[PDB]
Amino acid sequence: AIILPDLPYAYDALEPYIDAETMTLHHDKHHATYVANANAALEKHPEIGEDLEALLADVEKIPADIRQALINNGGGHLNHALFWELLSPEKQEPTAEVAAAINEAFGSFEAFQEVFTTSATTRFGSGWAWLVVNAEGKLEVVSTPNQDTPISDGKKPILALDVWEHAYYLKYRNVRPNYIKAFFEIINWNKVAELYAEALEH
């Protein structure tokens, strides 16, 4: 069964940039729901196993009677599990490997930050902004709706920002640009590096 992972840090470890109340609800209610619902789907189809990264890579291969349920809830699990690991109680900067990759794709960190900020800001309705490795090993910024993940498009996420209103409304209310700015103070660049390196390996 899919298990709800604990946060890597205290509920208040990302203050003042994300409030503890939001960390609490976000993890203990939202993410827990996704996990429950993902487990309900998977239990109908024990034959498919519980490797959600692999299952979500080709959604058409998921059995039709649980396909949207698994996309939405298995995707909600994957995305939030990743999100928590990508947040750091301590300030960081991109490691050399990642900074070089960013410059290769976007020219400069400032350009990347503009592009990713824009992606996060213009996502209409619920969704996520991502930095991903494509099948050629090169970086892209993309956003997705609801709990859709770029894994389903053959991409490997290295950075993820939740832009559902639940992720920011208690502190930031309508002002999602302030939330997006705040995120850049709490990125776990070392975790981005790990995911980047893993994406190149095979």
Instruction: Please give the residue ranges that form the binding site for its own copies (CB under 8 A).
Output: 25, 29-30, 33, 72, 124-127, 145-147, 164-166, 169-170, 173-174
The reply to whether 112 sits near Fe ion by the rule CB under 5 A is: no
Query: The dihedral of CA 20, 81, 93, 132: what is its sign?
Result: negative
Instruction: Judge whether 25 and 166 are in contact, CB under 8 Å.
Output: yes
- List CB contacts of 113: < 8 A, sequence separation 6 or more: 184
Q: Distance between CA 27 and CA 89 in Å, rounded? A: 16
Q: Which residue is nearest to Fe ion (CB)?
A: 162
**Partner from Fe ion, its own copies, none contacting 162, C-beta within 5 to 8 A by type:** Fe ion
Q: How far is the CB of 124 from Fe ion (least distance, A)?
A: 12
166 is in an annotated binding site: yes
The reply to whether 19 sits near Fe ion by the rule CB under 5 A is: no
Q: Distance between CA 132 and CA 196 in Å, rounded? A: 8
The reply to whether 164 sits near Fe ion by the rule CB under 5 A is: yes
Among 162, 168, 186, 189, which residue sits at the site for Fe ion (rule: CB under 5 A)?
A: 162
30 is in an annotated binding site: no
**Partner from Fe ion, its own copies, none contacting 39, C-beta within 5 to 8 A by type:** none
**Partner from its own copies, Fe ion, none contacting 61, C-beta within 5 to 8 A by type:** none
Tell me if residue 111 falls in helix, strand or coil.
helix
Tell me if residue 159 falls in helix, strand or coil.
strand
φ, ψ of residue 124 in degrees (nearest 5): -95, 130
**Partner from its own copies, Fe ion, none contacting 46, C-beta within 5 to 8 A by type:** none
Strand extents, DSSP E, the chain: 127-133, 139-145, 156-162
Residue positions forming the annotated binding site for Fe(3+): 26, 80, 162, 166
Q: List residues near Fe ion by CB under 5 A.
A: 162, 164, 167
